[PDB]
Amino acid sequence: VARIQLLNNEFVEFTLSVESTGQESLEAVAQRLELREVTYFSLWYYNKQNQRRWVDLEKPLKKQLDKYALEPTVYFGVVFYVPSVSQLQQEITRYQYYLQLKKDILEGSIPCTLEQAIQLAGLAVQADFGDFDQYESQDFLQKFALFPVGWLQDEKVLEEATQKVALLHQKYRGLTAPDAEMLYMQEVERMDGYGEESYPAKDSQGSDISIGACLEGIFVKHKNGRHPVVFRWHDIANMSHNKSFFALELANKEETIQFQTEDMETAKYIWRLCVARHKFY
Numbered sequence: 001v002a003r004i005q006l007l008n009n010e011f012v013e014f015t016l017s018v019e020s021t022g023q024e025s026l027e028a029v030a031q032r033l034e035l036r037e038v039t040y041f042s043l044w045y046y047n048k049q050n051q052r053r054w055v056d057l058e059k060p061l062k063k064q065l066d067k068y069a070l071e072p073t074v075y076f077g078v079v080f081y082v083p084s085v086s087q088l089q090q091e092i093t094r095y096q097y098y099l100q101l102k103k104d105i106l107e108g109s110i111p112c113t114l115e116q117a118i119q120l121a122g123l124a125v126q127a128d129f130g131d132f133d134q135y136e137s138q139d140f141l142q143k144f145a146l147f148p149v150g151w152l153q154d155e156k157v158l159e160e161a162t163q164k165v166a167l168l169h170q171k172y173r174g175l176t177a178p179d180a181e182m183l184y185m186q187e188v189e190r191m192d193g194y195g196e197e198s199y200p201a202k203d204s205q206g207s208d209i210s211i212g213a214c215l216e217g218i219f220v221k222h223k224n225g226r227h228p229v230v231f232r233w234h235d236i237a238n239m240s241h242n243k244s245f246f247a248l249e250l251a252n253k254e255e256t257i258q259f260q261t262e263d264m265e266t267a268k269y270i271w272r273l274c275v276a277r278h279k280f281y
């Protein structure tokens, strides 16, 4: 018996056969949610080094969890981030996407100042609880996750910010939940780090780098103080892996750029996800 953790802090148990693929589990989650735009979403697990890894949806799920996972839990989530949530057509799709974006914020995976957090929390509170005066006090706000890694904030800062959220909340009276969610996602959309996943590596000259995927293409960051380089999706002719190396074949001069990742299994994984993102964009 395995577990699928959903985007709203609920879970589903399920019996894992030997042959059932990751795709089959994803489709079952989608039927459960009545989600009709499933292409943006997939399933991930924590690997044996506690790193997040998206499931190979083509392969049987159970072998993947046995071989690479610490425990038989997968997480439902957005694997293909969209430049504009307005391209999501249906309310159920937007709501799931909203839950993911709120998660990205509350976990700190999209960095966020406290003032940005207060503005986002005001919209989330309107979306999640509706108009402020249905609740004869806002003392319930004190016991909810409102802010990124909020439990680590000083109590006085936390009290003050929660009071600001309560006041922002009153200003949003009359906003429906779909509209409040869209306004929330529209803000998160424009924040640095939205849609980004990255991995440690070295470039062909031994320097340490972070490499990964963003909306625009494959990015590389060095730790000097300069600026990241982005290989735009359409400037990328092909991608490959061999041993621990992951490679981009660029369209301009057929130049091939190598990157050395932690091991051969990591290079294959990075390759698989980056190929899939290239195809999606």
Ligand SMILES: [Cl-]
Pocket (backbone or CB within 6 Å): 042, 054, 079, 273, 276
């Ligand atoms: Cl994928």
